[PDB]
Amino acid sequence: HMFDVVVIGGGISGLSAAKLLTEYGVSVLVLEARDRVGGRTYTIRNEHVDYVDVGGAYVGPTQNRILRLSKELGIETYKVNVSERLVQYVKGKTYPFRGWNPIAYLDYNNLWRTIDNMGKEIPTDAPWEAQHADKWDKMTMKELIDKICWTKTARRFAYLFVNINVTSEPHEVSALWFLWYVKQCGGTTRIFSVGQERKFVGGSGQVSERIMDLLGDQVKLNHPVTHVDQSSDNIIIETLNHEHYECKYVINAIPPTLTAKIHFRPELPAERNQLIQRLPMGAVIKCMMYYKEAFWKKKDYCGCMIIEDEDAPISITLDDTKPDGSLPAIMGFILARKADRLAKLHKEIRKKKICELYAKVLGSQEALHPVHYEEKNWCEEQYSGGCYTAYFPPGIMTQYGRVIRQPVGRIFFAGTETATKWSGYMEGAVEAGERAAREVLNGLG
Numbered sequence: 001h002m003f004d005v006v007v008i009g010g011g012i013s014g015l016s017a018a019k020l021l022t023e024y025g026v027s028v029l030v031l032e033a034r035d036r037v038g039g040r041t042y043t044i045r046n047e048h049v050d051y052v053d054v055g056g057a058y059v060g061p062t063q064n065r066i067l068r069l070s071k072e073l074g075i076e077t078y079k080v081n082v083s084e085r086l087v088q089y090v091k092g093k094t095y096p097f098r099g100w101n102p103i104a105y106l107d108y109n110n111l112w113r114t115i116d117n118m119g120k121e122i123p124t125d126a127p128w129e130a131q132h133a134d135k136w137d138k139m140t141m142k143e144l145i146d147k148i149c150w151t152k153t154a155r156r157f158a159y160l161f162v163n164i165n166v167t168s169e170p171h172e173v174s175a176l177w178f179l180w181y182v183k184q185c186g187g188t189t190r191i192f193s194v195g196q197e198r199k200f201v202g203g204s205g206q207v208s209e210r211i212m213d214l215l216g217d218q219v220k221l222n223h224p225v226t227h228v229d230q231s232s233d234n235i236i237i238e239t240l241n242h243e244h245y246e247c248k249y250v251i252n253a254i255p256p257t258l259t260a261k262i263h264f265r266p267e268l269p270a271e272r273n274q275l276i277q278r279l280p281m282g283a284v285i286k287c288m289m290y291y292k293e294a295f296w297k298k299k300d301y302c303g304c305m306i307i308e309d310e311d312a313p314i315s316i317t318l319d320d321t322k323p324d325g326s327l328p329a330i331m332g333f334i335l336a337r338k339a340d341r342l343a344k345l346h347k348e349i350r351k352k353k354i355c356e357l358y359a360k361v362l363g364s365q366e367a368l369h370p371v372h373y374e375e376k377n378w379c380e381e382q383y384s385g386g387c388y389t390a391y392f393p394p395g396i397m398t399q400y401g402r403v404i405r406q407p408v409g410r411i412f413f414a415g416t417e418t419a420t421k422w423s424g425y426m427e428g429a430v431e432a433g434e435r436a437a438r439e440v441l442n443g444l445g
């Protein structure tokens, strides 16, 4: 019942906070809505797959927080095999290699150059302060692309870059925000690696699980927080089943839209009440297709494909075979408006649709005979809102966004949507948690 801090939510962010706080001898309790920790990271384990991340999986270099943490937790990593030739799919046929129009590629990298130069103006700690904030916030990321790119290849190809990175549609997202977003990953280069990718040996879900190991029964599953009352020195916290917990500080560690569902006494300041209200989550279905053999490797196909076809389920693919070569698999995201559209469908109908995409992208009959299939659809995510992260619609960043990680009395704000480096990724979840934890620490001693 009685603790120094309560952490709302036990994804990587809430758990990171909790662990640091624990390192300093602070009494922490974690209330977590689900019957598992890990949130948007989730490793399904079953005899068909051994294990598989249906959520966040990939960590890059430069991402030292989650690397240091996982390493401490005793979790190894492995290099995602980007073995052979990448395949792009455009306008029916398919092309193997780099990106093939001159003037259009001169357009290509000019766009990524511009996006970065534009990045320079935007303070990562406060994008709302950018000299050109207003112009850029009013502006949709689609019009920006159009205003910059002279050709429709670049333009089209860019839309899909936006799709892949923020699971959303260009017309729906603030230019300011997107430009910030990329910048805060180290810019165009880093974010989307032409490209040392890694996954955790055994699942990214381990990061959370192992911290729950450290915390024991101070992590409470099936405890969705519904009220936070702050009005009297001791903070009373209520969960769905009308259990009560009291503590001296709170750390909100759940995404904006979800924070909005909690009842706050006193109310959150009007400004913030609006912000958290207006950042929608993105939309993805993550899909692992399993095959008896790694047939794509055999045709010198990497197994990673960038698909920019109108009516094709999957938009981007990666090989996902185990580090030793057992249980060959192809991981694909079906995302943004495609996710919304195909979410309706039965799992089995997606599986067939997907298989025949692969058949004709890979020109192989064996793509039609999967051995097993796993997917989580994150749109339909009650305790997540969606993946990978929250986006900013136009004008929102500057109307309310300033207040994005500011305390209210004794309530502090974590969650990857509040990081200033790799916001939206597992890395960002850590940065957030830890930052929030330290904030609480200063509010002590």
Ligand SMILES: *[C]C1=C([C])[C]=[C@@]23C(=[C]1)N([C][C]([O])[C]([O])[C]([O])[C]OP([O])(=O)OP([O])(=O)O[C][C]1O[C](N4[C]=NC5=C4N=[C]N=C5[N])[C]([O])[C]1[O])C1=NC(=O)[N]C(=O)C1=N2C3#C[C]N([C])[C][C][C]OC1=[C][C]=C(Cl)[C]=C1Cl
Residues within 6 Å of the ligand: 008, 009, 010, 011, 012, 013, 014, 031, 032, 033, 034, 036, 037, 038, 039, 040, 041, 054, 055, 056, 057, 058, 059, 164, 165, 192, 193, 195, 197, 223, 224, 225, 226, 253, 254, 255, 258, 262, 284, 285, 286, 304, 316, 317, 318, 378, 383, 384, 386, 387, 388, 389, 414, 415, 416, 417, 423, 424, 425, 426, 427, 429
């Ligand atoms: C879902 C997802 C997917 C599908 C995918 C992915 C992802 C995801 N991602 C993202 C991540 O995951 C995120 O960011 C994170 O995780 C976040 O975290 P946090 O902050 O913590 O949050 P969460 O998890 O959610 O947690 C929370 C918690 O809480 C709870 N709750 C709620 N409510 C409540 C509660 N409690 C109490 N009470 C109440 N009230 C919940 O339940 C939870 O638990 C990712 N990430 C990373 O990092 N990585 C990755 O991968 C990922 N994934 C995405 C995608 C990405 N991309 C694409 C990029 C990368 C790259 O890729 C590539 C490259 C190259 C080529 Cl060629 C290809 C490709 Cl694909």
